[PDB]
Each structure stands twice: as structure tokens, then as C-alpha cells.
Amino acid sequence: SKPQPIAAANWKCNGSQQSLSELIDLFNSTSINHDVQCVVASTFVHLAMTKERLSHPKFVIAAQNAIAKSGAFTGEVSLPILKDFGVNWIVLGHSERRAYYGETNEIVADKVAAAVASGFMVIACIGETLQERESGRTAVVVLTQIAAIAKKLKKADWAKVVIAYEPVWAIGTGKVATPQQAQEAHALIRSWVSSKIGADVAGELRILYGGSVNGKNARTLYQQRDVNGFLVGGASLKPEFVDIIKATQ
Amino acid sequence: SKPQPIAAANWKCNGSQQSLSELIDLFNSTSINHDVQCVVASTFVHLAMTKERLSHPKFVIAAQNAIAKSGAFTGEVSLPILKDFGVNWIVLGHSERRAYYGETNEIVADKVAAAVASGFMVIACIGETLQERESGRTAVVVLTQIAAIAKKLKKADWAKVVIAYEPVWAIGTGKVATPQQAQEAHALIRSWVSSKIGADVAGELRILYGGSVNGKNARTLYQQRDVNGFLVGGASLKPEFVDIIKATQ
């Protein structure tokens, strides 16, 4: 079969106590008969609320970033503080962090290795920018990015990793990648993994699609052979999210 | 005659619910008889616990950083979000932020302007490094730092501003700043404000020392004319912070 899908809500830098609670009541009331792991990535400020109010057994709370070690880094949150707080999932390498907060492939590779070592389940994000896609650099970019992460990880380390493919050009622009494009980027990444890591690994690996996924387009994307779930922005702030969940099995 | 002082605990990237809750306790049991504003800047993750537990009438909580607007900034936390959460104080432009996280003078100044626009009381941070210092550039750097923040505020805005001078040259370098030196950097700032903004603003402005402060050197530092409190790193995670508050008598 396919490995257990994932339907992850990335709330980004948004919400209010009230708006978010709403969402959570919504989610908590939802029924999900199939095997799927739902993840809610809230801002650090609202990790308390969520963790207290989110009761659905199929959902887990996640952070949206972190640094590897506690210390003199004013403004940042480290993995240790996260763990102590009860958080076991984290999103790392987000294109927004890469494009605006100087996160290079190394920096990402590192946070991931560290996160893995501290025992977290990590969603690592990889993907090309409009300009690279237009140059015909898709394969080199994605493969380089994955290989960066791969370096620091050990075989067994893979059981905690979930890869997120997100074509930067599909980010909050409405330009969703076609199922073809999506499946073609996922198969490539997956070939690399069985080639460099092992087919056993490539087979259990969850690879998500991110980039303007919505209630409507979810089903066809999910229908692809190498598409195991989704990493969702905007629609995740809507009840429509529920639809997204239902499209994966 | 000096304005009301401020004793600001910058917990930086540290803390565990256990250790933090104990400090809180200690802090709440403290008898402070003078007019001082005590601020506790915790990680984003700990804001809730912090809010619930601190009960001392003389304490307020603040955050270590923020972005101006909500949106597609994974990992980031904005003003509106903090505003809803009940946080009204913010530390901004911290030397650890300018060093490792790309905060230019221009970024810190827009961040300051937004916070002010939003009602926050802001602790804005400035200070030169060993090199600028070594080279005779102390005043040029400091003044540029203050001016940049100032080209976005109006006179009335200053009622919401607190400046913390950070002796970067003396941090992690092997060096030691004496009281006379803190004082010189502080007077310099005051004269610039006093001169570009107004003498009225100037005499009211709080300029906090952001260097190495312990329970032993606090009073002699407080003893200096243009010294209005401290922005404490390390000693804030220790009971010694209590001697730090008293030193503002």
C-alpha cells in the first residue's frame, strides 16, 4: 500500500485565541475513520492553548521552527525548550525561512539532524523557486537540497523524517502544480532515496505536497502514486481543511 | 532626578517549566518598596505560563522579538498575535539579533515604529562592537543606530520608548567595561535625544545599561547619572536578579 499519509496544517504567522479555538473545536468534532496522522503547526505563542484544547486522537501539535541548542539567542526557541514543553513534531526548512531568514541547505541539514537526535518527528521542506524551474534546474535543486539533509542523517534516522515538496511558485499564489508536476517531483526524490539510502527506506518514506492545496484540488493530487499527504497553508485556517484530510487514504 | 527605573530580565533562549516556575515564585515573594518597573522577557513558548504565574504588582511580561504583521512567515511571531495574547512590552533590535539574524538598522527601526504604532512599550537595543570601538567609531555607530530608529517616530511616540545601551565590545571579548564607560555611552545618547528631539523628552527617556550586571556591580552602575536600570542577560535566570532590582533604589 502507501505509507500512512499525513495532513499537516501549517498556520504560519497567523491567528487569535478566538479564531484558533474555533478551528480546534471544529477539528475535535471531526470524525476520521481512516489511518492518517494530522498535524497542527501553530505559532510558538499558541502552543499552550492548542495543546490544551486540541483533543482529537488523530492530531498532533508541531512547532514551525527552532534552533538546536538553548542559550544566548534572544527571540529564538530551541529544541530542548520544545521537548520539555511536550512538542515532538516540527517543521524545518520552510521556504519562507530559507528566503527570508537566511536558512541555507547546511543550516537546514543541521537543524534536521539535531531535531532527529533529540527524538522529534521532522517535516523537512525542499522545493524550487520560479526562476530555477524556468531555467530547467528543478532536478539539481531538489536533489541537492535532499542530499544536504541526507548527509547528516543515519539510516535509522529516516524513520523520523517526512519530506515536504513545495514548489516555491505554488506558495500562496493559487498556482498549484499539476498532479503530473507533483508526481514527477515526488518520484524523482523517491528514486534518489532508494538509490542512496535503500528501497526499504524509500518505501516507507512519507513525501508531502505543499503549495495551494485546497478542498477541491486535494483528491487528484492525493491520487498520485508518490503523494503521501499534504502540508497546507491558507486552507488550514479554514474548515475546508477537513476536506483535505478526507482526501487522503 | 531620574525617571522611573526599569529592571528587565532577558531570559534569552532558556528555561524549563520547572526552573522557570521556581524563579517566578521567588520573584512573587519579593518585597519591592520603590517605584520600579520590573519586566520579564521570556521565550514565546513560555509566555502563557508566565502570564498565569507572575503575580507581583511590579512585574510585566514582554517578548524577545516580533515581526510587524501576521502572514506567511513560518516560524515567526507578529505584533497583532502578541497584542491579542496580552503582551504589551517588547525587546527589539537585540545585539544577538543584529549579529546572527540579519537585523539591520533599518529593520530594527521599522520593527520599533510598528510596535509603537501598536501600543507596545518597547525596549530598543543599541551598541557598538569591539572593532567599531577599537577604531574610534563609538559615537558614529551609536548615533546612527538611534537616529535610524528616530527617523520613524514622532515626539509623542518617545513616551513609549526605552533605550538599552549594549556594550558589545565588552561581550564575549575578554574586555571589561567600567561605570565611567557605561556612563559615557549613556550620556552620549541622552545628548543626541536632548538635542534632536527635545530636552523634555530627554529628561524623561529611560536608558538602560545592557552589559554585564551582577548583584555586585549593579548599585555602582545605578550610581551613574544617565543610568536608569538594566537589561540583564545571565543573572536574570538567578535569584540574584532580586539584588538587581533593589539596586535601583
Side-chain angles (χ1 to χ4, degrees), chain B residues 60-94:
Chain B
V60 285
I61 74 181
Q64 302 166 25
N65 186 48
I67 63 188
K69 317 277 176 268
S70 315
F73 305 117
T74 298
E76 306 289 314
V77 165
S78 67
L79 298 169
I81 297 195
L82 307 159
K83 200 158 143 90
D84 177 78
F85 203 67
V87 165
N88 195 240
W89 279 72
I90 177 103
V91 167
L92 281 158
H94 189 280

Short mmCIF file of all heavy atoms in Angstrom, two decimals, chain B residues 60-94:
data_model
loop_
_atom_site.label_atom_id
_atom_site.label_comp_id
_atom_site.label_asym_id
_atom_site.label_seq_id
_atom_site.Cartn_x
_atom_site.Cartn_y
_atom_site.Cartn_z
N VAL B 60 5.84 42.95 34.62
CA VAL B 60 5.01 42.90 33.45
C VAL B 60 5.78 41.96 32.59
O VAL B 60 7.00 41.83 32.80
CB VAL B 60 4.80 44.18 32.65
CG1 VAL B 60 3.86 45.15 33.34
CG2 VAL B 60 6.11 44.88 32.39
N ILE B 61 5.11 41.31 31.63
CA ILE B 61 5.87 40.42 30.77
C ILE B 61 6.07 41.07 29.42
O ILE B 61 5.27 41.92 29.02
CB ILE B 61 5.22 39.07 30.58
CG1 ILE B 61 4.08 39.37 29.63
CG2 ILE B 61 4.71 38.69 31.96
CD1 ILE B 61 3.25 38.14 29.30
N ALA B 62 7.14 40.65 28.75
CA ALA B 62 7.48 41.17 27.46
C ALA B 62 7.97 39.99 26.65
O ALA B 62 8.18 38.94 27.21
CB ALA B 62 8.71 42.02 27.68
N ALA B 63 8.15 40.18 25.36
CA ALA B 63 8.62 39.14 24.47
C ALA B 63 9.98 39.58 23.97
O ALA B 63 10.30 40.76 23.98
CB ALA B 63 7.67 39.04 23.28
N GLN B 64 10.75 38.64 23.47
CA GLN B 64 12.09 38.89 22.97
C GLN B 64 12.23 39.37 21.54
O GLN B 64 13.32 39.75 21.12
CB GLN B 64 13.02 37.72 23.35
CG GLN B 64 13.09 37.50 24.89
CD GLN B 64 13.72 36.13 25.20
OE1 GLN B 64 14.49 35.63 24.37
NE2 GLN B 64 13.39 35.53 26.35
N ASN B 65 11.13 39.40 20.78
CA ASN B 65 11.13 39.84 19.40
C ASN B 65 9.75 39.70 18.75
O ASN B 65 8.82 39.09 19.29
CB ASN B 65 12.08 38.94 18.59
CG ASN B 65 12.35 39.30 17.12
OD1 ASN B 65 12.65 40.48 16.82
ND2 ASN B 65 12.28 38.29 16.22
N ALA B 66 9.67 40.27 17.55
CA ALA B 66 8.47 40.16 16.79
C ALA B 66 8.57 40.68 15.38
O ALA B 66 9.52 41.39 15.06
CB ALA B 66 7.24 40.62 17.55
N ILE B 67 7.63 40.28 14.52
CA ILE B 67 7.58 40.80 13.17
C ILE B 67 6.37 41.74 13.19
O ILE B 67 5.50 41.61 14.06
CB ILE B 67 7.57 39.83 12.01
CG1 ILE B 67 6.34 38.96 12.01
CG2 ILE B 67 8.84 38.99 12.00
CD1 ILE B 67 6.45 37.87 10.95
N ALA B 68 6.29 42.71 12.28
CA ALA B 68 5.18 43.66 12.25
C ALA B 68 3.81 43.11 11.83
O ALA B 68 2.79 43.58 12.34
CB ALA B 68 5.52 44.85 11.35
N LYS B 69 3.74 42.16 10.89
CA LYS B 69 2.42 41.74 10.52
C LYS B 69 2.36 40.25 10.37
O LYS B 69 3.36 39.60 10.00
CB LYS B 69 1.98 42.29 9.16
CG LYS B 69 2.29 43.76 8.87
CD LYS B 69 1.28 44.76 9.44
CE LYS B 69 1.61 46.25 9.26
NZ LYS B 69 2.36 46.88 10.37
N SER B 70 1.13 39.78 10.64
CA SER B 70 0.75 38.38 10.55
C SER B 70 0.84 38.00 9.08
O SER B 70 0.88 38.89 8.21
CB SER B 70 -0.54 37.94 11.21
OG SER B 70 -0.64 38.50 12.51
N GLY B 71 0.93 36.69 8.82
CA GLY B 71 1.05 36.29 7.45
C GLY B 71 1.98 35.11 7.29
O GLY B 71 2.28 34.39 8.22
N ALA B 72 2.39 34.94 6.06
CA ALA B 72 3.23 33.87 5.56
C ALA B 72 4.69 34.09 5.93
O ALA B 72 5.53 34.45 5.12
CB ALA B 72 3.05 33.82 4.05
N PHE B 73 4.93 33.84 7.21
CA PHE B 73 6.24 33.98 7.79
C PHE B 73 6.36 32.82 8.76
O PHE B 73 6.24 33.04 9.97
CB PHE B 73 6.23 35.33 8.54
CG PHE B 73 5.83 36.50 7.65
CD1 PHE B 73 4.67 37.24 7.90
CD2 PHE B 73 6.62 36.87 6.56
CE1 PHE B 73 4.27 38.32 7.11
CE2 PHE B 73 6.25 37.95 5.75
CZ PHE B 73 5.08 38.67 6.04
N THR B 74 6.54 31.60 8.21
CA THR B 74 6.62 30.40 9.03
C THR B 74 7.66 30.55 10.13
O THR B 74 8.76 31.04 9.88
CB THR B 74 6.91 29.17 8.15
OG1 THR B 74 5.86 28.99 7.24
CG2 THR B 74 6.95 27.90 8.98
N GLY B 75 7.35 30.12 11.34
CA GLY B 75 8.33 30.20 12.41
C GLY B 75 8.29 31.51 13.18
O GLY B 75 8.63 31.46 14.36
N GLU B 76 7.86 32.62 12.52
CA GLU B 76 7.77 34.00 13.05
C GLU B 76 6.57 34.30 13.91
O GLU B 76 5.62 33.53 13.83
CB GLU B 76 7.99 35.14 12.02
CG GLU B 76 9.35 34.96 11.27
CD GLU B 76 10.50 35.27 12.23
OE1 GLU B 76 10.47 36.26 12.94
OE2 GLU B 76 11.46 34.34 12.32
N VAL B 77 6.65 35.38 14.73
CA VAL B 77 5.53 35.76 15.59
C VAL B 77 5.39 37.27 15.52
O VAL B 77 6.38 37.94 15.79
CB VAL B 77 5.78 35.38 17.05
CG1 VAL B 77 4.80 36.10 17.94
CG2 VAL B 77 5.78 33.88 17.33
N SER B 78 4.20 37.78 15.16
CA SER B 78 3.90 39.21 15.00
C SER B 78 3.22 39.91 16.16
O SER B 78 2.71 39.28 17.08
CB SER B 78 2.92 39.38 13.83
OG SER B 78 1.68 38.80 14.21
N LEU B 79 3.20 41.24 16.06
CA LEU B 79 2.62 42.20 17.00
C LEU B 79 1.13 42.00 17.33
O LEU B 79 0.67 42.05 18.50
CB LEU B 79 2.93 43.65 16.51
CG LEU B 79 4.44 43.98 16.45
CD1 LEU B 79 4.70 45.29 15.71
CD2 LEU B 79 5.07 44.04 17.85
N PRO B 80 0.33 41.77 16.29
CA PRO B 80 -1.10 41.52 16.47
C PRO B 80 -1.32 40.29 17.34
O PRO B 80 -2.10 40.26 18.29
CB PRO B 80 -1.67 41.36 15.05
CG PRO B 80 -0.67 42.01 14.11
CD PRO B 80 0.61 42.26 14.91
N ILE B 81 -0.54 39.24 17.05
CA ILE B 81 -0.59 37.99 17.79
C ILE B 81 -0.24 38.21 19.27
O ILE B 81 -0.89 37.61 20.16
CB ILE B 81 0.29 36.90 17.16
CG1 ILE B 81 -0.18 36.52 15.75
CG2 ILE B 81 0.39 35.66 18.05
CD1 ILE B 81 0.42 35.21 15.25
N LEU B 82 0.81 39.05 19.51
CA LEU B 82 1.21 39.29 20.88
C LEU B 82 0.17 40.18 21.53
O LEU B 82 -0.21 39.95 22.69
CB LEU B 82 2.66 39.81 21.12
CG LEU B 82 3.82 39.01 20.52
CD1 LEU B 82 5.07 39.88 20.40
CD2 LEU B 82 4.16 37.84 21.40
N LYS B 83 -0.29 41.16 20.75
CA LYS B 83 -1.32 42.09 21.21
C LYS B 83 -2.53 41.33 21.72
O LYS B 83 -2.98 41.62 22.82
CB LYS B 83 -1.65 43.17 20.20
CG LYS B 83 -2.33 44.43 20.74
CD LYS B 83 -2.11 45.61 19.77
CE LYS B 83 -3.26 46.59 19.58
NZ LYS B 83 -3.25 47.73 20.52
N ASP B 84 -3.06 40.35 20.97
CA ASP B 84 -4.21 39.56 21.42
C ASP B 84 -3.92 38.73 22.66
O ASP B 84 -4.71 38.36 23.52
CB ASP B 84 -4.54 38.57 20.26
CG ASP B 84 -5.66 37.58 20.51
OD1 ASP B 84 -6.84 37.91 20.44
OD2 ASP B 84 -5.31 36.37 20.88
N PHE B 85 -2.69 38.32 22.76
CA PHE B 85 -2.27 37.49 23.85
C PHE B 85 -2.06 38.27 25.13
O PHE B 85 -1.78 37.69 26.18
CB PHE B 85 -0.99 36.77 23.39
CG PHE B 85 -0.80 35.52 24.17
CD1 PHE B 85 -1.69 34.46 24.00
CD2 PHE B 85 0.25 35.39 25.09
CE1 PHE B 85 -1.51 33.28 24.73
CE2 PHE B 85 0.44 34.22 25.83
CZ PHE B 85 -0.46 33.16 25.65
N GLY B 86 -2.16 39.59 25.04
CA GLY B 86 -1.99 40.37 26.24
C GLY B 86 -0.58 40.78 26.57
O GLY B 86 -0.31 41.17 27.71
N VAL B 87 0.32 40.72 25.60
CA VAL B 87 1.71 41.12 25.84
C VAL B 87 1.84 42.57 25.37
O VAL B 87 1.46 42.87 24.26
CB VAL B 87 2.69 40.10 25.24
CG1 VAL B 87 4.11 40.65 25.16
CG2 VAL B 87 2.63 38.83 26.10
N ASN B 88 2.33 43.48 26.20
CA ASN B 88 2.45 44.90 25.85
C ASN B 88 3.85 45.48 25.87
O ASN B 88 4.07 46.66 25.57
CB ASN B 88 1.52 45.79 26.69
CG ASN B 88 1.40 47.18 26.08
OD1 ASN B 88 1.74 48.21 26.71
ND2 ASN B 88 0.94 47.23 24.83
N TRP B 89 4.80 44.62 26.23
CA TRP B 89 6.17 45.08 26.23
C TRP B 89 6.94 44.20 25.25
O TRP B 89 6.63 43.02 25.12
CB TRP B 89 6.84 45.00 27.62
CG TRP B 89 6.52 46.13 28.56
CD1 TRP B 89 5.33 46.33 29.17
CD2 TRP B 89 7.41 47.16 29.03
NE1 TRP B 89 5.40 47.41 29.99
CE2 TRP B 89 6.66 47.96 29.93
CE3 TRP B 89 8.74 47.51 28.78
CZ2 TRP B 89 7.20 49.10 30.55
CZ3 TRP B 89 9.27 48.63 29.41
CH2 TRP B 89 8.52 49.41 30.31
N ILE B 90 7.94 44.79 24.59
CA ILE B 90 8.72 44.04 23.65
C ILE B 90 10.17 44.52 23.70
O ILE B 90 10.40 45.70 23.92
CB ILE B 90 8.10 44.13 22.25
CG1 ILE B 90 8.93 43.41 21.21
CG2 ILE B 90 8.08 45.58 21.79
CD1 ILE B 90 8.35 42.08 20.83
N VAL B 91 11.14 43.61 23.53
CA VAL B 91 12.54 43.95 23.48
C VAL B 91 12.79 43.94 21.98
O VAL B 91 12.31 43.01 21.35
CB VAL B 91 13.43 42.87 24.11
CG1 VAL B 91 14.91 43.09 23.75
CG2 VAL B 91 13.32 42.90 25.62
N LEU B 92 13.46 44.91 21.36
CA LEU B 92 13.65 44.80 19.90
C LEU B 92 15.05 45.20 19.50
O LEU B 92 15.60 46.06 20.15
CB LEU B 92 12.69 45.69 19.05
CG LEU B 92 11.28 45.07 18.90
CD1 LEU B 92 10.19 46.09 18.56
CD2 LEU B 92 11.26 43.81 18.03
N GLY B 93 15.63 44.66 18.43
CA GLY B 93 16.98 45.09 17.97
C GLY B 93 18.19 44.61 18.80
O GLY B 93 19.33 45.13 18.77
N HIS B 94 17.91 43.56 19.54
CA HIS B 94 18.92 42.96 20.34
C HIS B 94 20.16 42.57 19.54
O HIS B 94 20.00 42.01 18.44
CB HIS B 94 18.35 41.80 21.15
CG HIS B 94 19.34 41.32 22.15
ND1 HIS B 94 20.38 40.45 21.78
CD2 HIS B 94 19.42 41.60 23.48
CE1 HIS B 94 21.07 40.24 22.92
NE2 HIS B 94 20.52 40.91 23.95
#
